């Protein structure tokens, strides 16, 4: 949607002065993704760390994967739903 972002002028200073009117600050006060793009990408770091630690074999010999008895490490990846604590975080619930 560029045709409605043609009208957003004065946005670097508007994004910077949110420190005086917002408690929770933002670390990326200098870039604005709609106007400026994704200026950085860290996807290859997660690939090279797994070659750095030695691979999935030398990671998984530390873990408890051998005692579970999955067939393959590829089944470690799912859309895991939290279950109990998802239900419990919304209830009326003491500070402690």
């Amino acid at each position: 949607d560029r045709h409605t972002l043609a009208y957003d002028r004065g946005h670097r200073i508007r994004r910077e002065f949110k420190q005086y009117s917002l408690e929770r600050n933002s670390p990326f006060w200098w870039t604005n993704s709609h106007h400026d793009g994704k200026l950085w990408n860290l996807n290859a770091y997660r690939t090279d760390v797994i070659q750095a630690l030695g691979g999935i074999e030398t990671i998984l010999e530390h873990t408890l994967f051998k005692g579970t008895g999955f067939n393959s490490w590829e089944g470690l990846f799912w859309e895991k739903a939290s279950g109990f604590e998802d239900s419990m975080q919304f209830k009326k619930l003491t500070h402690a």
């Binding site: 996807n43 290859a44 997660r46 690939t47 090279d48 797994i50 070659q51 590829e74 990846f77 799912w78 859309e79």
Partner: peptide, 16 residues
């Protein structure tokens, strides 16, 4: 498979 991320499906340079 759908579930694995793209940081695992990527082979590095030196496996090519």
């Amino acid at each position: 498979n759908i579930h694995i991320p793209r940081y695992i499906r990527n082979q590095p340079w030196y496996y090519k």
